[PDB]
Design a binder for this molecule. Sequence first.
Ligand SMILES: [Zn+2]
Ligand SMILES: [Zn+2]
Lengths: 436, 240, 96
Amino acid sequence: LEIYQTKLLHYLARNFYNLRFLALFVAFAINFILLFYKVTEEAMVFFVLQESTGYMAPALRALAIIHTVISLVCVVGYYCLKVPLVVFKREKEIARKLEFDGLYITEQPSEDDIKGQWDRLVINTPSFPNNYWDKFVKRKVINKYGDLYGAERIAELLGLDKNALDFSPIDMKYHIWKLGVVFTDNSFLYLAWYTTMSVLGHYNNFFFAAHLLDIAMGFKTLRTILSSVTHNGKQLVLTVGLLAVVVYLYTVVAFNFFRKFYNKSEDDDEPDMKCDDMMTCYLFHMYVGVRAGGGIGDEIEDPAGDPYEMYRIVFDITFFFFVIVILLAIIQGLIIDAFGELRDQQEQVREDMETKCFICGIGNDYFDTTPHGFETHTLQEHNLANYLFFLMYLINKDETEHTGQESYVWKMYQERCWDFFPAGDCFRKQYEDQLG
Amino acid sequence: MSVLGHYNNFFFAAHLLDIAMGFKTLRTILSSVTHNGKQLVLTVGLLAVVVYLYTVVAFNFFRKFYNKSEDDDEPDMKCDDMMTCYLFHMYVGVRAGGGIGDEIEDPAGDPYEMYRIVFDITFFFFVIVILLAIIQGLIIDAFGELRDQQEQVREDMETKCFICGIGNDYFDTTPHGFETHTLQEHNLANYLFFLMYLINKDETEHTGQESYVWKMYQERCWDFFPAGDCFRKQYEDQLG
Amino acid sequence: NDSRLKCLLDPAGSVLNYFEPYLGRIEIMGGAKKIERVYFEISESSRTQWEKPQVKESKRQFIFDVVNEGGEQEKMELFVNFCEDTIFEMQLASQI
Ligand SMILES: [Zn+2]
Ligand SMILES: [Zn+2]
């Protein structure tokens, strides 16, 4: 049973993205079927699927069940594929803050830091750290801080027995903390919302219309396009607020001086005054004036032959210029500037990667004296993947088997000292006389 | 199409599209549309999805406002089924200046007045204002990107040699030295003419240098092209 | 600049060509205040998991973030954090 459970969990973890694309395909099919609905009065309103074949309603029920199953197994596959990395990052950050800052020994988390208060629950658990590979965190913290804070107090803080320090001849709290970490993850919350809408789709089929919004999360090109909207989204919200304030000012002016022009009634038996109170006039200006092509002047009474004709003309013209022309141009310019800024950031990345080394920072003109010397330097001498593979080699090796250089780098790595990375120097630069 | 123009003369109207292929300026202008054409198609698809969502909301809650009939003898309900309401939203609401609110019943004096106002305002903001701005911004960004690519070509050709890659500041110690280097020493046309000379020559008549370059050329080995080195750099002590 | 070694490496050409994928080189600043070259072993599973498209996307996202929004922090600290996260991801992908 355990072997089959492990195989099922690994199969769901391996095919997570394929199941997400399958869910998107099923949602598209469901909405294509939903396009064939109609309303019948036989009062009581009935939603009937008009069809000349008689097959689309069992197909709709089958697709709803299939979509709910796929959403559930997508959540399960997410828990076995992406949750370990999130827990690994959180545990690593907790360990670094505990050892190199004294987060729960010397200092304390602020009242505005919910993460520190929640992570206080995990330090005394015996399972911590579970995904982080450094299993001597508590011993390091004890050895660092017991001289000035007492070994017994820190051992009680870190959930370590006094007899457990020497030889001396289901963890519920950790899982509660892990559930709290998982439930605050954005992708898990998105998948939980997706599954909730899939479950609600059986209560009413049109709840399957929300899943089409997954195209905003599934395709990289659409994410890049929507990044032009979310780049300056704060400025967009502030521009909409500024538009609301300006329209409120025009509403105040109209309610004080131009009330007679807001009769929207065809017949004189019953008027339809839109500006006899401030709330109705403000709603009218925000809903009718902004959407109108020429401003508020398109939708109110003609001001000709009136004592306030020139004031009304100035009112309409400044409403057209300030709101219709300028603020919408600010919105469009923010979107276009977002496009240009993203393109400039990508070009900056390209130029920085082409002009200097990522490790040592020496420019390509020094290396290019040798034919194709910078390509040789970035592919063989200071290759980033080689540094990743060396860290992977050092971690997966016994400390008693370390050589002198490996011990040197390992000791500097455990202290978070990155002076072993070459900075402004390389093998060619140091032995330039001997190699040349 | 020219042959079909004898069957019906209006088939000759297609050939005017040849102005898009005949003039270089028109091709450059249409490159601002075809640069981000994939993003344009994806934006139109996103607009279709958003309008479908608004159609679902209107078909569930706002069916009474979609009567487009002047007389009460025979109604013209546009949202009594999902297909008609979706076609109405995609064809009438998008082309309208103020959104779907321009073309349906006035919501005043209704229990669902505020929901209808929020519906119309968010249709106007998300579809009319934002998505068309995304389309226009994609076109303008295509213009700017093409201009930046041309300026990058100009700067790269002015600042370093195409063959050896040495910058102009090394050559410009001699007066007009970089122009001399790019016109006489490492001229691209001279390398083209040398390859043309090598191909059109008998192998038995090749000299030692020509045989060396020919053997390296048949193996696709381009180590004979100087890279980071030139005649002035190698003999700098003897020439200077 | 030794010719006897070049006459010695000729029979080792096939052996040196076999271990070329598995032979990793880095350069460090050693304890003698000199640049040293470190030779180590790269496993084949590490090579296969490094060349996955998702790992490549993660690497290019990391480079983008370091170049643009990489200020106010040491670049090598961010690089080591990226390496640790990538190593964990690769090990998890090898487990499943
Ligand atoms: Zn380097
Ligand atoms: Zn040159």
